[PDB]
Amino acid sequence: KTRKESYAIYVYKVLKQVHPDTGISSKAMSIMNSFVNDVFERIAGEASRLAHYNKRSTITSREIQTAVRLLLPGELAKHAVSEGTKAVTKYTSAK
Amino acid sequence: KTRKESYAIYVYKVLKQVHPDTGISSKAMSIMNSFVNDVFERIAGEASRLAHYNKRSTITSREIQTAVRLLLPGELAKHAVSEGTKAVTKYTSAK
Amino acid sequence: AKTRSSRAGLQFPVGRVHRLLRKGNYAERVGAGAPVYLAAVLEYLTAEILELAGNAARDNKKTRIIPRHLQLAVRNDEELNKLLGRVTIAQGGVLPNIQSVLLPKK
Amino acid sequence: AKTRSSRAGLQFPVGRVHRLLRKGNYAERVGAGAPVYLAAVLEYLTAEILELAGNAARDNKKTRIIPRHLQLAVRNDEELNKLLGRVTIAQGGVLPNIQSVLLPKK
Amino acid sequence: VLRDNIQGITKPAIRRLARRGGVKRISGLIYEETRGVLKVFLENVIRDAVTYTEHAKRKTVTAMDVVYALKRQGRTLYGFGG
Amino acid sequence: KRHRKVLRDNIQGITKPAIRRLARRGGVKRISGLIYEETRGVLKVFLENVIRDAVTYTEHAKRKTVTAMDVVYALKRQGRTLYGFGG
Amino acid sequence: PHRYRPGTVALREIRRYQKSTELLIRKLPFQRLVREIAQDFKTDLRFQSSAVMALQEASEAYLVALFEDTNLCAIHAKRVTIMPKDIQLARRIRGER
Amino acid sequence: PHRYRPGTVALREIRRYQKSTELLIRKLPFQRLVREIAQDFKTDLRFQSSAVMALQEASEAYLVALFEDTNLCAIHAKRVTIMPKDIQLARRIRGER
DNA sequence: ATCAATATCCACCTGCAGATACTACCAAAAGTGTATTTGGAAACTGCTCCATCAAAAGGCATGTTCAGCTGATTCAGCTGAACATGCCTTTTGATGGAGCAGTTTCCAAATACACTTTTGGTAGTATCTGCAGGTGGATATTGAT
DNA sequence: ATCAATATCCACCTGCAGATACTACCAAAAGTGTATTTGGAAACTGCTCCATCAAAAGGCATGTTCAGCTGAATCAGCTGAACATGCCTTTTGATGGAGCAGTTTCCAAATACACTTTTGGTAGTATCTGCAGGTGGATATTGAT
Ligand SMILES: [Mg+2]
C-alpha cells in the first residue's frame, strides 16, 4: 500500500532522449536506480563532510561541486561539473 | 587563541587506572586522540545509517549497540556491549 | 506552477533531490542550487551509462537493455569502471578475456 | 550537582559525547542513553589498547608509552589489528618478521 | 545419504565459476579450499545481515538486510533495492 | 617576492639507498636493479592522488596553505587513514 | 572413436561461461548453506526469496573475481594450474588474511 | 681483507630497520618532491610542515607494506629477488588497477 | 596432406513472459505566496608559522669484485581432463499460514529556553625526569680454513 | 672442530627536551529546572509471499585412461651484494612577512508555516511484443591418420 518511490521514470525519460528506439528490462532499471541512489549518497556524503570540515551549516552547490571533483574520475568529473554549473545558471536566470 | 579540545585527560585517567606508573608521550597521546575520534565517527556513522534504514529519527543506545556489533570484531564487541549496557543500566537507576 | 526541474532544463527531480538532502542529515541547512547541481550530475551520469549500454544493446542485436548491457558498458569504459570498481551489477557476468599463455599453440 | 559521567560510572565525558553527537548530524534526535553507551564503549577500547601498550613499554624497559608501543599493541592483537586494519600509526614501524626461505643454510 | 550442505557446492559448480574467471586447469585441492573461502564470505555477510534483521525486530532476512550488509563489507550490489 | 626557483626531477631524491631501506623494513632480502625506477613511479602515483585531494580541500576552504588536516582528510577518503596529525 | 585433447573443452567452457550471466551454483544447495550458516546467528529465521538471490549474486561475483586473481597468481609462478596457494596469496594480498 | 657473504648484511639490515621507526627517506628531497607535484596541480601553494610530515609518514607506510606484498609475490615464484613484475602483481591484486 | 566427428553459425518461426499503455485517484509531495530566523562574505587587524636566507653533521655516488641466484633445459612421473548415463537431487508448480506491514494511539522521553554552576583549556613562569646518545668494556656471530 | 674480524649487547652516565606541575583565570562549556512537542512502542489485523511438498526435469557422481603439466636436477652466465673511497647534500639553528584566523556588522538567503496545485505510484484491466528457445543446413574446427 505505502507508495514506493524510485528514479525509474526519470531514468526512462533520459533513456528516450538518448536512445528513443531502445527499452529497458526491469532488472536493468533496478540497477540504474541503485546507481543513482549510490552516487547520490556518495556525493551528499562527501559534501556533508566538506561542510563540517569547514564549520559551515549549509550544503551549497560549491560543496556538491568539490564533492564531485573528489569522487569522479578526471573526464567524468569535468563534464559533470559543467552540466552542474550549467543547470544552475539556467535555473537562476529563469524567472 | 581558540580552544582546541581533545580526549587527552580522559585517556590519561584511564591510563592511570591500568598502568599507574606509566606515562604517555604527546605523540602517543595524539594517536590515542585520533583513535577515539575515529571510532566515535565510525560508530556514529553506522548508527546514523541504521536509523535511516529503519525510518527512525532518533539515535538511542539501542542504535549505538547494533553499530558496535556491526563495527567491532567478535570478542571486543561482546565486551564493549557489556560495558555500555552496564553504563546505561547504571545511568537509568542513578536519579 | 512550474517545476524547478523544467526551470533548470532537467529531466531529474530537483524537488525530490532537495527533499532527500534535508531528510538525510547531511547538514543543518541546504542552499537552493545544490539540488539543482546535484540533480544535473545524476542526470548526466545516467545518460552516459544509458548511451553506452544502448550501444552495447545495439552490438548484440537488441533493443531492450538488460543487466549484461550495463556491465559491458561500465567495464569497457576506464572511467565508469573506476567509479564502479567496488560495485557488483547483478546478472552482469564478466568481459570475455583469456590470458594469452592459456591459448593453444599455432 | 553531579555529572552524568559519575552517574554512569565513567571517566569518559558524557556531556561532551552528547554534544558531539548533536553537531555531527547523525540524526534529528539523540536519545539520552546513546552518549552514555558510546562513551562507555570508547572508554572500554581505549583501556584495552592502553593495557597492551603499557606492556609493550614495559617489555622494552620504558616507562613512557610512545607510538611504537601502540603499534606493537595493535598489531600483536588479532582483534585490534582488524579494527585498525586500514589505519596507520605515525611513527609505529612494523612487526619484526622475516620470511623463512630468506634465512641462511637449509 | 547423509551429507554436509557445504558439499552441495559441488565440483562441477565450482569448476564453472572458475571457468567464468578464465581458469583452464584446476588442482583437485581447489574444491575444498573454495568451499572454505565461500563459507567465510557468507558468514561475514550473513552475520551482518541478520544483525540488521534483529535490529528491525523481524524474523525474516530481507533483501535490504543483505544489500546493506554487502555495502558495509565493501561489496556494494546493484539490483535488489536501496 | 623576487624570483622563484624551478622544481624539476625531484623524484630522483628518492635515492637507491633510501628505497633499499624501505624494502628492508618490508622484509626484502634481494632487489633487482629495475625496482628503483618502478618504485619511483609507484610513489609518484601515490603522491599525486593524495596531493590532488589534499589541495582540493585546501582550495575549497579558500586557503593557500595545505594543512596537515587537508592531507589527513585526503588520506581518509582514499582508505589510508593516518593517526598522529590531528585526525 | 573421437576424443578431445586436455584443455580444449576447458577453453570452450571459458568462452561459454564468459559469454553468459546465469548463476552457476544450483539454487537449492546454496539456499540450505545460507540457512545453515544463519542458524548459528539466530534461530527460527526466514529469508525473502530476493535476499537469498542477492547473496548468491554477490557470492558468485566474489568467487569469480577471486578466480581471476588466483589465476594471475598461478601464471606468476609460471604455471597454468590453480592451486590453493594461489588462492591464499590472492587473499593475503587483498587484505583478507 | 674480510667479507660477509651476500645476504648477510641484507638480513642484518632487515632486523635493524624492522626494529626502528624513523623515516627512511631524507626529509628535504621528499619535501621538494611534494612541492613539485603540488605545484603541477596548483601554483603559489604553501605547506604546513606537519602536512609534509603527514605525507611522508603515509608514503613510507604505504611503500613498506607494498614491499611485503611484493616480497610474497617473488617468494610465490620460488625466487628471493623482488622484480617489477612482483610489484605489478601486488598492485593488480590489491585493486590499484 | 585427407577425412570425419562435432561444434558453431546464421536464418527463419513462434507463444508469452515480460514489457509498455492507461485511467482513475487520491493522496501525498512539490510548488506558491507571507513572516521569521540565521548564516557567512567583507572589512579589519593581531600574530602564528611559513618561506628564506648561512654553518655543521654524515649519508650518497661510483667502480670493482665475485658469490650465488635466476632462468633455460631436460625429463620422469603424477595428476587432472575427458569421457558415457543411469540415478538421485534439484526444479517447477500447488497450497495453507507466519509474519510483515499498514494504522492508529498516547505517553515517556526529547526538544526548547533560561539562569547557575563547573570545568576543561592556556598561559605565564616554574621544576622535575625519562631516556637518547655518548663512552668503554664483555660476549655473540660469521666465514676462512 | 680452531682463529679472528666484526657486529652486538650490555651497563653506566649525563645534558636537556619534553613532560609533569601549579596558580591565575574564564569562556564556554555542562548542569539544573520548568514548559511544551511528539516519536515510536504497542496493539490489533489483513494479505502478501514464504516453507512445505508432490511431480516433473535433468545435471552430476562414478572409475577408467593417458596427455601433458608440474617440479626436481643440473648448469652457465651474469646480476646484484658487499665494500672502499672521495665528497656533495642534507640537517640543524637563528632571522624577515604572507596569510590565517579571530572579531563584528549586515543583508542575501534559507527556514517555517500554511495553502493550493500536480505528479507520480498503483492498480485495474487490458494491451502489446522482443526474443529465448527450437529447427535445418551450410561451414568451421579439431583431431585422427
Ligand atoms: Mg612543475
3 state SS for A23-89: EECHHHHHHHHHHHHHHHHHHHHHHHHHHHHCCCCEECHHHHHHHHHHHCCHHHHHHHHHHHHHHHH
Residue pair F27/H8 in contact by the 8 Å Cβ criterion: no
Q: What is the DSSP letter of D98?
A: -
Measured in angstroms, the resolution is 2.8
At how many degrees (to 10) do helices A26-53 and F35-60 cross?
Answer: 70
Q: Under an 8 A CB cutoff, do C90 and G54 touch?
A: yes
Of G57, G84, G91, the CB nearest to E77: G57
DSSP letter at H80 equals: S
Q: Say which residues have a Cβ less than 8 Å from residue H92's Cβ, sequence separation at least 6.
A: G69, G72
H23: nearest CA in chain D? D91
Q: Contact, H14 vs F27, CB < 8 A?
A: yes
Residue F3: other Cβ atoms inside 10 A: 5
Q: Are C9 and A87 in contact (CB under 8 A)?
A: yes
> Which CATH code of 1.10.10.10, 1.10.630.10, 1.20.1240.10, 1.10.20.10 fits the domain covering B1-95?
1.10.20.10
- d(CA G17, CA E19) in angstroms, rounded, equals 6
Burial of H85 (0-12, 13-18, 19+ CB in 10 A): middle
Nearest to D7 among B44, B75, B94 (CB): B94
- Give the residue from D25, D28, D29 with the most C CB atoms within 10 Å of its CB, the best one to mutate: D25
Round to whole Å and give the CA distance between D93 and D90. 8
- 3 state SS of E53: helix
Q: Which residue in chain E has the smallest CA separation from C99? A: E22
- Grid coordinates representing G63 are 568467487
Which chain A residue is nearest to residue C70, measuring alpha carbons? A28
Taking CB atoms and an 8 Å limit, are A48 and D24 in contact across chains?
Answer: no
Nearest to D67, CA basis, from D95, D90, D85: D90
Q: Output the CA angle G74-G80-G84, nearest 5 degrees.
A: 45
Of D25, D27, D28, the CB nearest to C27: D25
Which residues, including other chains, have CB under 8 Å from residue C23's CB and lie 6 or more apart? Answer: none
The number of distinct structural domains making up chain D is: 1
CATH of the domain at C9: 1.10.20.10
- Interface check for D101 against chain F (CB to CB < 8 A): the answer is no
Q: Which residues contact E1 (CB under 8 A, 6 or more apart)?
A: none
Q: How many residues does chain F have?
A: 87
Compute, in angstroms, the gap from residue B91 CA to the centroid of ligand 1: 60
Q: How far is C-alpha B4 from the chain's CA centre? A: 20
Q: In terms of CA atoms, which chain D residue is nearest residue H19?
A: D96
Give CA–CA dist A62/C34, Å, rounded.
8
E strands of F1-87, at which residues?
30-31, 65-66, 81-83
Touching status, chains D and C (3+ beta-carbon pairs under 8 Å): yes
Measure the CA–CA gap between H7 and H1, rounded to whole angstroms.
19
Which residues in chain D are contacts of B25 at CB distance < 8 A?
64-67
What is the signed CA dihedral for E64, E66, E69, E75, rounded to 10 degrees? -110
DSSP assigned state of C102: G
Distance from CA of F51 to the nearest CA of A (A): 12
Q: Does A54 touch chain F if contact means CB atoms closer than 8 Å?
A: yes
Q: Cβ contacts of residue A89 below 8 Å, gap of 6+?
A: none
Q: Is F78 on the interface with D (CB under 8 A)?
A: no
- Distance separating alpha carbons of residues F55 and F70, to the nearest angstrom: 7
Compute the distance between CA of residue C21 and CA of residue C29 in angstroms, rounded to an integer.
9
Other Cβ atoms within 10 Å of B49 Cβ, number: 19
Give CATH superfamily name and number for F1-87: Histone, subunit A (1.10.20.10)
Q: How far apart are CA A23 and CA H13, in angstroms?
A: 64
Q: Which phi-psi region, left, alpha or beta, contains residue E61 (left: φ > 0; alpha: ψ -120 to 50)?
A: beta
CB contact under 8 A, B27 and F84: yes
* CA distance, residue D80 to nearest chain H CA (Å): 18
Tell me the residue range of the domain where D97 lies: 1-106
Residues 6+ apart with CB under 8 A from G10: E19, E24, E25
Domain residue extents for chain A? 1-95
Assigned architecture for domain H1-97: Orthogonal Bundle (1.10)
All cell numbers assigned to F84:
598522529
Q: DSSP code of E77?
A: E
| 3-state secondary structure (DSSP) of residue C23 | coil
Q: Which amino acid is at A20?
A: P
State the cell numbers at A56.
559551515
List residues bridging with C64 in a β-sheet. Answer: A23
Contacts with B92 from chain D: Cβ below 8 Å: 33
Q: How far apart are the first and last CA of chain F?
A: 34
Nearest to residue D92, comparing CAs of D70, D68, D65? D68
Q: Which three cell numbers stand for residue E3?
A: 551429507
Residue G78 C-beta-side C-alpha neighbours within 13 Å: 5
> Are C79 and A78 a contacting pair, CB within 8 Å?
no
Neighbours of chain G (3+ CB pairs under 8 A): C, E, H
Q: Do A70 and F53 touch (CB under 8 A)?
A: yes
The closest alpha carbon to C86, from G59, F42, G52, E70, belongs to: E70
Comparing CB atoms, the residue among D86, D90, D93 nearest residue F84 is: D90
Longest alpha-carbon distance in chain A:
49
**Dist. CA H35 → ligand 1 center (Å):** 9
Q: Do chains B and F touch (3 or more CB pairs under 8 A)?
A: yes
Instruction: Evaluate whether H34 touches H55 at the Cβ level (below 8 Å).
Output: yes
Which DSSP category does E56 fall into? T
- The full set of domain ranges for chain F reads 1-87
Helix (H) or strand (E) holding D65: strand D64-65
Helices and strands (DSSP H and E) totals, chain C: 5, 3
H67 in reach of chain G (CB within 8 A): no
How far does residue H43's CA lie from ligand 1's centre (Å)?
9
What is each CA distance from E37 to E6, F20, G21, G32, in whole angstroms? 11, 36, 22, 17
Residues within 5 A (CB) of ion ligand 1: H 40
Please tell me which chains touch B, using 3 or more CB pairs under 8 Å as the contact test.
Answer: C, D, E, F
Q: Record the cell numbers describing residue G36, joined without a space.
A: 545453515
Q: Which H or E element spans position B21?
A: none
Residue D82, SS3 per DSSP: helix
Long-range Cβ contact pairs of A5-12 (< 8 A, separation 24 or more):
A5/C16, A6/A33, A7/A32, A7/A33, A7/A36, A7/A37, A7/C12, A7/C42, A8/A32, A8/A33, A10/C11, A10/C12, A10/C13, A10/C43, A10/C46, A11/A36, A11/C46, A11/C50
Q: Judge contact between D43 and B14, C-beta under 8 A.
A: yes
- State how far the alpha carbon of F39 is from the alpha carbons of B58, E23, F45, F52, in Å: 50, 31, 10, 20
Task: Report residue H76 as a C-alpha cell.
Answer: 610465490
Helices (H), ranges, D1-106: 4-8, 14-23, 34-59, 67-76, 78-83
Distance F11 CA to ligand 1 centre (A): 12
For residue C3, give the DSSP letter: -
Judge contact between E52 and G39, C-beta under 8 A: no
Separation between the CA of G42 and the C1’ of J86 (whole angstroms): 74
Contact C18, C30 (CB under 8 A): yes
3-state helix, strand, coil in chain B (%, to 5): 75, 5, 25
**D40 Cβ contact partners less than 8 Å away, ≥ 6 residues apart:** B80, B83, B84, B86, B87, B88, D8, D10, D12
Phi-psi region of H95 (alpha: psi -120 to 50; beta: other; left: phi over 0): left
Q: Which CATH number fits domain E1-82: 2.40.30.130, 1.10.20.10, 3.40.718.10, 3.10.20.30?
A: 1.10.20.10
